[PDB]
Scaffold this active site. Sequence first.
Site, mmCIF file in Angstrom:
data_model
loop_
_atom_site.group_PDB
_atom_site.id
_atom_site.type_symbol
_atom_site.label_atom_id
_atom_site.label_comp_id
_atom_site.label_asym_id
_atom_site.label_seq_id
_atom_site.Cartn_x
_atom_site.Cartn_y
_atom_site.Cartn_z
ATOM 1 N N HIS A 44 1.114 -1.121 0.024
ATOM 2 C CA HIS A 44 -0.005 0.158 -0.123
ATOM 3 C C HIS A 44 0.908 1.081 0.035
ATOM 4 C CE1 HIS A 44 -3.682 -2.546 1.718
ATOM 5 N NE2 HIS A 44 -3.942 -2.206 0.527
ATOM 6 N N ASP B 139 -2.449 -10.969 -1.650
ATOM 7 C CA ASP B 139 -3.168 -10.223 -0.756
ATOM 8 C C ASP B 139 -4.582 -9.914 -1.073
ATOM 9 O OD1 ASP B 139 -4.035 -7.862 1.161
ATOM 10 O OD2 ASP B 139 -2.103 -8.342 2.014
ATOM 11 N N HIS C 83 -6.276 -7.294 -0.462
ATOM 12 C CA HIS C 83 -6.391 -6.054 -0.687
ATOM 13 C C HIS C 83 -5.562 -5.627 -2.147
ATOM 14 C CE1 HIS C 83 -6.931 -6.159 3.717
ATOM 15 N NE2 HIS C 83 -8.000 -5.304 3.409
ATOM 16 N N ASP D 151 -4.301 -12.966 3.788
ATOM 17 C CA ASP D 151 -5.834 -12.376 4.279
ATOM 18 C C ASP D 151 -6.916 -12.725 3.581
ATOM 19 O OD1 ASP D 151 -4.473 -10.500 2.768
ATOM 20 O OD2 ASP D 151 -4.986 -8.875 3.988
ATOM 21 N N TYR E 101 -3.914 -12.088 8.884
ATOM 22 C CA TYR E 101 -4.189 -11.673 10.323
ATOM 23 C C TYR E 101 -4.654 -12.845 11.134
ATOM 24 C CZ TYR E 101 -3.277 -7.543 7.940
ATOM 25 O OH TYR E 101 -2.669 -6.530 7.106
HETATM 26 O O1 LIG Z 1 -4.067 -6.212 4.765
HETATM 27 C C1 LIG Z 1 -3.691 -5.306 4.423
HETATM 28 C C2 LIG Z 1 -3.832 -3.928 5.320
HETATM 29 C C3 LIG Z 1 -4.995 -3.848 5.987
HETATM 30 C C4 LIG Z 1 -5.929 -2.533 6.132
HETATM 31 C C5 LIG Z 1 -7.120 -2.560 6.030
HETATM 32 C C6 LIG Z 1 -8.045 -1.462 6.362
HETATM 33 O O2 LIG Z 1 -7.333 -0.773 7.478
HETATM 34 N N1 LIG Z 1 -7.758 -1.446 8.822
HETATM 35 C C7 LIG Z 1 -8.882 -2.469 8.969
HETATM 36 O O3 LIG Z 1 -9.540 -2.597 8.232
HETATM 37 C C8 LIG Z 1 -9.128 -2.675 10.248
HETATM 38 N N2 LIG Z 1 -9.860 -3.676 10.790
HETATM 39 C C9 LIG Z 1 -9.882 -4.334 11.683
HETATM 40 C C10 LIG Z 1 -10.667 -5.456 12.278
HETATM 41 C C11 LIG Z 1 -11.857 -5.768 11.305
HETATM 42 C C12 LIG Z 1 -12.775 -6.691 11.782
HETATM 43 C C13 LIG Z 1 -12.420 -7.629 12.656
HETATM 44 N N3 LIG Z 1 -13.451 -8.678 12.787
HETATM 45 C C14 LIG Z 1 -14.415 -8.915 12.126
HETATM 46 C C15 LIG Z 1 -14.711 -10.207 12.851
HETATM 47 C C16 LIG Z 1 -14.257 -10.487 14.245
HETATM 48 C C17 LIG Z 1 -13.107 -9.458 14.046
HETATM 49 C C18 LIG Z 1 -11.332 -7.452 13.343
HETATM 50 C C19 LIG Z 1 -10.553 -6.339 13.205
HETATM 51 C C20 LIG Z 1 -8.827 -3.874 12.286
HETATM 52 S S1 LIG Z 1 -8.039 -2.601 11.760
HETATM 53 N N4 LIG Z 1 -3.020 -4.834 3.456
HETATM 54 O O4 LIG Z 1 -3.052 -5.921 2.420
HETATM 55 ZN ZN LIG Z 2 -4.373 -7.161 2.781
HETATM 56 ZN ZN LIG Z 3 -3.939 -8.140 -4.029
#
Ligand SMILES: O=C(CCCCCONC(=O)c1nc(-c2ccc(N3CCCC3)cc2)cs1)NO
Ligand SMILES: [Zn+2]
Ligand SMILES: [Zn+2]
Length: 354
Positions: free
Chosen positions: A134, A172, A174, A265, A305
């Site tokens: 990102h 990924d 995203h 993820d 995660y």
């Molecule tokens: O992976 C990445 C980078 C990620 C960036 C995504 C957006 O920014 N942050 C987020 O979405 C966040 N969401 C959470 C979160 C959401 C849902 C749940 N839960 C649903 C069910 C229970 C548990 C737990 C935690 C924490 S922060 N790049 O490739």
């Molecule tokens: Zn991701």
């Molecule tokens: Zn991707």
Amino acid sequence: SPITGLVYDQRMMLHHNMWDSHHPELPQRISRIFSRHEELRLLSRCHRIPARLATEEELALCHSSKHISIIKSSEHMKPRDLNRLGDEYNSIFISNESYTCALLAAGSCFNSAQAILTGQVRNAVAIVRPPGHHAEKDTACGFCFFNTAALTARYAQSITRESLRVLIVDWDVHHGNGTQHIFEEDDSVLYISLHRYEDGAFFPNSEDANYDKVGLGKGRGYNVNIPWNGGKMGDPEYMAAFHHLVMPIAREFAPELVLVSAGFDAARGDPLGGFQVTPEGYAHLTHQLMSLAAGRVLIILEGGYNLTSISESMSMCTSMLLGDSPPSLTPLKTSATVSINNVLRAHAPFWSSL
Ligand SMILES: O=C(CCCCCONC(=O)c1nc(-c2ccc(N3CCCC3)cc2)cs1)NO
Ligand SMILES: [Zn+2]
Ligand SMILES: [Zn+2]
Ligand SMILES: [Zn+2]
Ligand SMILES: [Zn+2]
Ligand SMILES: [Zn+2]
């Protein structure tokens, strides 16, 4: 003498969120993965590649001096100031160790790329954090500070030749917006991303991730977005995207080095992705990619995660890299077929194998 390299360093665990110790981008993402490699007896089979800091000149391959300057300044900030700086970005936390860890992430991947390109190893796996894809030229975003994968691709070119054909496969869940933008006008680096899109309702919430962004100028046809909509996508969906889209294009590109932005993820059990790709699924994707570039593949941890899912999934990829048989194996979801056909339509003007 081992064919597969492995880089892991527990100093990359130092990056943490001061105000939420339970933030999903956990330190033990990498240690659990590493620990699982030990359990499945893969660690004994790999050549251990040392981690190192990326230099500032190496960062400048992709990132502006301004960006570099700011993330470096975080090193000597009080908590209050870390908090403030962090909240200037989308989804970012920063500690005093963050910069070191981000340097370590990139430098580890540079060493891995160099080990592949000098024939020390055939392929490699990088158990690194924080993630990279990102990260833009000018800004951090989505837990990412610098674009490890993008930087590694440029590093590779600079120690070989500038026209070295590098493929980046980003699975990924995203869209790797930073990677897309960096190479958006480049025909020497092929970016292919599969990601949940939901018409821009899924992070990073931009039309940039849609199938119709195909690169610009010289880079026309060298950016391939495969967005998923309205479906809990899994192994059939990703296997189909590979058969119909990814592998045909990759073969035609004929890369000299394959870089995987390997976020896990999209795995079943992942709270952020909500997809259901299995570790065996990921194995079969790795296996297929190994038919490219004489098996010269570098797996780089991005997102993911669920500690169990990411540990299992990435260990399986390493197994494939080591040359093990894939573990064995549902009709495709409709919306996935819709997505695939849109991408086929958008990239038919560039790739004759479609
Ligand atoms: O992976 C990445 C980078 C990620 C960036 C995504 C957006 O920014 N942050 C987020 O979405 C966040 N969401 C959470 C979160 C959401 C849902 C749940 N839960 C649903 C069910 C229970 C548990 C737990 C935690 C924490 S922060 N790049 O490739
Ligand atoms: Zn991701
Ligand atoms: Zn991707
Ligand atoms: Zn084993
Ligand atoms: Zn490109
Ligand atoms: Zn595209």
